[PDB]
Design an enzyme around this catalytic site. Structure first.
Site, PDB file in Angstrom:
ATOM      1  N   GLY A  13       0.647  -1.111   0.100  1.00  0.00           N
ATOM      2  CA  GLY A  13       0.167  -0.078   0.021  1.00  0.00           C
ATOM      3  C   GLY A  13       0.834   1.091  -0.168  1.00  0.00           C
ATOM      4  O   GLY A  13       2.165   1.162  -0.167  1.00  0.00           O
TER       5      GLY A  13
ATOM      6  N   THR B 112       2.429   7.050   4.657  1.00  0.00           N
ATOM      7  CA  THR B 112       2.681   8.649   4.826  1.00  0.00           C
ATOM      8  C   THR B 112       3.278   8.858   3.272  1.00  0.00           C
ATOM      9  O   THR B 112       3.037   9.943   3.000  1.00  0.00           O
ATOM     10  CB  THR B 112       3.706   8.755   5.754  1.00  0.00           C
ATOM     11  OG1 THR B 112       2.751   9.066   7.123  1.00  0.00           O
ATOM     12  CG2 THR B 112       4.589  10.469   5.736  1.00  0.00           C
ATOM     13  N   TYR B 113       4.490   8.265   2.889  1.00  0.00           N
ATOM     14  CA  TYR B 113       5.104   8.712   1.713  1.00  0.00           C
ATOM     15  C   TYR B 113       5.558   7.270   0.812  1.00  0.00           C
ATOM     16  O   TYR B 113       5.685   6.582   1.728  1.00  0.00           O
ATOM     17  CB  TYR B 113       6.068   9.603   1.724  1.00  0.00           C
ATOM     18  CG  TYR B 113       7.331   9.083   2.538  1.00  0.00           C
ATOM     19  CD1 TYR B 113       7.322   8.804   3.976  1.00  0.00           C
ATOM     20  CD2 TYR B 113       8.484   8.775   2.021  1.00  0.00           C
ATOM     21  CE1 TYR B 113       8.474   8.311   4.833  1.00  0.00           C
ATOM     22  CE2 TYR B 113       9.562   8.274   2.714  1.00  0.00           C
ATOM     23  CZ  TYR B 113       9.652   7.907   4.047  1.00  0.00           C
ATOM     24  OH  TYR B 113      10.632   7.429   4.680  1.00  0.00           O
TER      25      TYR B 113
ATOM     26  N   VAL C 296       5.845   4.146  -1.716  1.00  0.00           N
ATOM     27  CA  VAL C 296       4.957   2.772  -1.783  1.00  0.00           C
ATOM     28  C   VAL C 296       5.753   1.740  -0.883  1.00  0.00           C
ATOM     29  O   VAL C 296       6.865   1.662  -1.280  1.00  0.00           O
ATOM     30  CB  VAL C 296       5.099   1.964  -3.199  1.00  0.00           C
ATOM     31  CG1 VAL C 296       4.096   1.104  -3.077  1.00  0.00           C
ATOM     32  CG2 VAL C 296       4.454   2.989  -4.374  1.00  0.00           C
ATOM     33  N   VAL C 297       4.838   0.790  -0.214  1.00  0.00           N
ATOM     34  CA  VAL C 297       5.366  -0.336   0.568  1.00  0.00           C
ATOM     35  C   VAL C 297       5.191  -1.744  -0.081  1.00  0.00           C
ATOM     36  O   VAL C 297       4.091  -1.979  -0.364  1.00  0.00           O
ATOM     37  CB  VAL C 297       4.833  -0.411   1.917  1.00  0.00           C
ATOM     38  CG1 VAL C 297       5.318  -1.395   2.839  1.00  0.00           C
ATOM     39  CG2 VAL C 297       5.374   1.002   2.670  1.00  0.00           C
TER      40      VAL C 297
ATOM     41  N   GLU D 117      11.791  -4.869   8.966  1.00  0.00           N
ATOM     42  CA  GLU D 117      11.168  -6.285   9.209  1.00  0.00           C
ATOM     43  C   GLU D 117       9.752  -6.186   8.774  1.00  0.00           C
ATOM     44  O   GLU D 117       9.189  -5.243   8.822  1.00  0.00           O
ATOM     45  CB  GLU D 117      11.203  -6.508  10.767  1.00  0.00           C
ATOM     46  CG  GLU D 117      10.733  -5.315  11.694  1.00  0.00           C
ATOM     47  CD  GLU D 117      10.691  -5.877  13.098  1.00  0.00           C
ATOM     48  OE1 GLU D 117      10.920  -6.742  13.368  1.00  0.00           O
ATOM     49  OE2 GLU D 117      10.411  -4.919  13.951  1.00  0.00           O
TER      50      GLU D 117
ATOM     51  N   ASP E 242       1.071  10.454  13.575  1.00  0.00           N
ATOM     52  CA  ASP E 242       0.204   9.772  12.679  1.00  0.00           C
ATOM     53  C   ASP E 242      -0.128   8.302  13.151  1.00  0.00           C
ATOM     54  O   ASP E 242      -0.188   7.414  12.342  1.00  0.00           O
ATOM     55  CB  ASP E 242       0.839   9.567  11.167  1.00  0.00           C
ATOM     56  CG  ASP E 242      -0.354   9.426  10.133  1.00  0.00           C
ATOM     57  OD1 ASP E 242      -1.551   9.787  10.294  1.00  0.00           O
ATOM     58  OD2 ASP E 242      -0.215   9.107   8.978  1.00  0.00           O
TER      59      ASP E 242
ATOM     60  N   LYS F 183      -2.187   5.669  14.010  1.00  0.00           N
ATOM     61  CA  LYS F 183      -3.690   4.981  13.448  1.00  0.00           C
ATOM     62  C   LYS F 183      -3.464   3.502  12.989  1.00  0.00           C
ATOM     63  O   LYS F 183      -2.307   3.045  13.059  1.00  0.00           O
ATOM     64  CB  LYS F 183      -4.205   5.944  12.287  1.00  0.00           C
ATOM     65  CG  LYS F 183      -3.018   5.678  11.116  1.00  0.00           C
ATOM     66  CD  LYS F 183      -3.763   5.976   9.750  1.00  0.00           C
ATOM     67  CE  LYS F 183      -2.506   6.313   8.716  1.00  0.00           C
ATOM     68  NZ  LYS F 183      -2.814   6.876   7.793  1.00  0.00           N
TER      69      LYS F 183
ATOM     70  N   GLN G 257      -3.708   1.276  10.659  1.00  0.00           N
ATOM     71  CA  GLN G 257      -2.790   1.020   9.697  1.00  0.00           C
ATOM     72  C   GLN G 257      -1.165   1.023   9.848  1.00  0.00           C
ATOM     73  O   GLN G 257      -0.334   0.498   9.307  1.00  0.00           O
ATOM     74  CB  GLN G 257      -2.901   1.789   8.399  1.00  0.00           C
ATOM     75  CG  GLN G 257      -3.937   1.330   7.465  1.00  0.00           C
ATOM     76  CD  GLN G 257      -4.127   2.285   6.246  1.00  0.00           C
ATOM     77  OE1 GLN G 257      -3.590   3.223   6.230  1.00  0.00           O
ATOM     78  NE2 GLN G 257      -5.536   1.998   5.928  1.00  0.00           N
TER      79      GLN G 257
HETATM   80  N1  LIG Z   1       2.894  -6.688   7.567  1.00  0.00           N
HETATM   81  C1  LIG Z   1       3.591  -5.553   7.435  1.00  0.00           C
HETATM   82  N2  LIG Z   1       3.000  -4.322   7.159  1.00  0.00           N
HETATM   83  C2  LIG Z   1       3.516  -3.033   6.841  1.00  0.00           C
HETATM   84  O1  LIG Z   1       2.922  -1.982   6.339  1.00  0.00           O
HETATM   85  C3  LIG Z   1       1.356  -1.773   6.427  1.00  0.00           C
HETATM   86  C4  LIG Z   1       0.864  -1.067   5.019  1.00  0.00           C
HETATM   87  C5  LIG Z   1      -0.370  -0.516   5.439  1.00  0.00           C
HETATM   88  C6  LIG Z   1      -1.016   0.209   4.511  1.00  0.00           C
HETATM   89  C7  LIG Z   1       0.066   1.394   4.386  1.00  0.00           C
HETATM   90  C8  LIG Z   1       1.381   1.167   3.736  1.00  0.00           C
HETATM   91  C9  LIG Z   1       1.950  -0.004   4.569  1.00  0.00           C
HETATM   92  C10 LIG Z   1       4.938  -3.145   7.302  1.00  0.00           C
HETATM   93  N3  LIG Z   1       6.083  -1.918   7.332  1.00  0.00           N
HETATM   94  C11 LIG Z   1       7.011  -2.523   7.902  1.00  0.00           C
HETATM   95  N4  LIG Z   1       6.903  -3.660   8.287  1.00  0.00           N
HETATM   96  C12 LIG Z   1       5.438  -4.135   7.904  1.00  0.00           C
HETATM   97  N5  LIG Z   1       4.725  -5.252   8.000  1.00  0.00           N
END
Ligand SMILES: Nc1nc(OCC2CCCCC2)c2nc[nH]c2n1
Lengths: 297, 258
Positions: free
Chosen positions: A12, A15-16, A18-19, A82, A128, A130, A132
């Protein structure tokens, strides 16, 4: 620079950047990769990544997510974290018809406060908090994550960015325009999360700023000079606000005992000088029997 | 009043020792010297004034420059490029609205390109391993000011002026930790303005007595007395402004009776 990571899925936008979920092809480690496209003719490394990396390296704590690596190409910046089992949001939607048991709730809340007090004692405001941005593992731990809107605060504070905290979790002193704000805003966000765990829906799912204020006013009573000296002089306070009466918390959060109602009320006080700190909240009687259950995943 | 202020001061006492530049780095640079560094710093004070930057941003940019120069040898001609990228990074960390990169290219008088400034930004971040959250004399001072009942605004401006004068001279101030400089500056400003002395609540809070601040305070008293003769003058010029209550027009104490 990224040759050793294999993309598993796009998780998703936070804050900034893409993850993504990804795996280290040499060690097998599953990580979260936050990608930020930089270019060059633009501005260099954005201020959110500079703060998030610098501050997370000063925050080594069991309830704060681990930053494992930073890969700073010419083109892009990757933050490698992680990977935990999931975020509290999918878990809350991954309990909405049944409800997260109370013992779990109390455990997560006691942990989120120990994480937050550590942040505050290291002069970091998250700004921030929340569901999520909170991550749980399968053993019962929960961690603060996404420090992209964080900042180092000073003693005494000065004026900080006004556009902070996602609107549902946003404290009334920012909504009314206080010049200053500090650690109390994170605590307000945690009281909103605690109540959301208990009752199964956002406490104050305001659409807009005015909607967010009037949703807090209807549940907690329109603040006046008795509960919050100087509210009636604040920048965006209006004498024509409706005057609602405060609701009983036996109706706001029915499942809670009275230790719970008292701590939820101390976290949502209107006056930031009366709102309970994360450290004082750890001494609250609600946590006297806290234990550490395992989530059901 | 502020929740966490004592924890924060204890944590700052521990990070100033880890974030401290290496005291004789200048003897190992092959091309730059303490007087060049002094000129860079005096230029950053004017840049901070032109752009209306917090003083904290200045203090951070100097912390970054000294650490960067602790492990990187730099030619005199790229010393402004180091300085410029550092002020850029300190602005991004500390400012609500940091000047943009073109603003920073421009004040170099076009000596460098945008591409150089951005690549110097990436190298500074790599050498400092992204550790930008450091403690500065400004941060110690604003905590010590919470003890001086009612606040005295001239004392406060003068302590900040003296703490800013310490940034110009690597010799002798790279020897002292920020908390001790802040201590010496606060004693000397209070003393000069009201005759009062480092307070007993600060002694209990810091562990620092007037005797442990002595070495730093003799240096800073001399720096203050000789300010008129120093080659760099933007700090004295900045502190004549009414925003700083004109404290750089005050007369230094001829002695301190220590
Ligand atoms: N399982 C998981 N999810 C994450 O991000 C959630 C998503 C939720 C929606 C916004 C982007 C990140 C993580 N970040 C570091 N470790 C993480 N591990």
């Amino acid at each position: 620079s990224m040759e050793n990571f294999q993309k598993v899925e796009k998780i998703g936008e936070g804050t900034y950047g893409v993850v993504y979920k990804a795996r280290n092809k040499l060690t097998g480690e599953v990580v979260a990769l936050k990608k930020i496209r930089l270019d060059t003719e633009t501005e260099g490394v954005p201020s959110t990544a500079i703060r998030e990396i610098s501050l997370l390296k000063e925050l080594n704590h069991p309830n704060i997510v681990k930053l494992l690596d930073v890969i700073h190409t010419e083109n892009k910046l990757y933050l490698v974290f992680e990977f935990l089992h999931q975020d509290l949001k999918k878990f809350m939607d991954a309990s909405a018809l049944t409800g997260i048991p109370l013992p779990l709730i109390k455990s997560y809340l006691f942990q989120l406060l120990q994480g937050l007090a550590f942040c505050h004692s290291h002069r970091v405001l998250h700004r921030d908090l929340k569901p999520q941005n909170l991550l749980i593992n399968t053993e019962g731990a929960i961690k603060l994550a996404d420090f992209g809107l964080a900042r180092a605060f000073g003693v005494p504070v000065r004026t900080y960015t006004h556009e902070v905290v996602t609107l549902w979790y946003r404290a009334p002193e920012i909504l009314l325009g206080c010049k200053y704000y500090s650690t109390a805003v994170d605590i307000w966000s945690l009281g909103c999360i605690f109540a959301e765990m208990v009752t199964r829906r956002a406490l104050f799912p305001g659409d807009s700023e005015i909607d967010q204020l009037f949703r807090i006013f209807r549940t907690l009573g329109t603040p006046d000079e008795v509960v919050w000296p100087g509210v009636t002089s604040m920048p965006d306070y209006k004498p024509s606000f409706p005057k609602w009466a405060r609701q009983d918390f036996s109706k706001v959060v029915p499942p809670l005992d009275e230790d719970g109602r008292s701590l939820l009320s101390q976290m949502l006080h209107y006056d930031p000088n009366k709102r309970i700190s994360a450290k004082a909240a750890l001494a609250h009687p609600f946590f006297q029997d806290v234990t550490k259950p395992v989530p059901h995943l | 009043v502020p929740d966490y202020h004592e924890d924060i001061h204890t944590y700052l006492r521990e990070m100033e020792v880890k974030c401290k530049p290496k005291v004789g780095y200048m003897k190992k640079q092959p091309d730059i010297t303490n007087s060049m560094r002094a000129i860079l710093v005096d230029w950053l004070v004017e840049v901070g004034e032109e752009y209306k930057l917090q003083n904290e941003t200045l203090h951070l940019a100097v912390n970054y420059i000294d650490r960067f120069l602790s492990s990187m040898s730099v030619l005199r001609g790229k010393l402004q490029l180091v300085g410029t990228a550092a002020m850029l990074l300190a602005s991004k960390f500390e400012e609500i609205y940091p000047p943009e990169v073109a603003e920073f290219v421009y004040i170099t008088d076009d000596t460098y390109t945008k591409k150089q400034v951005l690549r110097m930004e990436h190298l500074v971040l790599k050498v400092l391993t992204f550790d930008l959250a450091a403690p500065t004399v400004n941060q110690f001072l604003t905590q010590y000011f919470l003890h001086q009942q009612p606040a005295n605004c001239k004392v406060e401006s003068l302590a900040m002026f003296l703490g800013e004068l310490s940034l110009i001279d690597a010799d002798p101030y790279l020897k002292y930790l920020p908390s001790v400089i802040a201590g010496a500056a606060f004693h000397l400003a209070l003393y000069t303005v009201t005759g009062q002395s480092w307070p007993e609540s600060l002694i209990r809070k810091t562990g620092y007595t007037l005797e442990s601040l002595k070495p730093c305070l003799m240096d800073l008293h001399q720096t203050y007395l000789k300010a008129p003769q120093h080659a760099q003058q933007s700090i004295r010029e900045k502190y004549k402004n009414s925003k700083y209550h004109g404290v750089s027009l005050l007369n230094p104490p001829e002695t301190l009776n220590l």
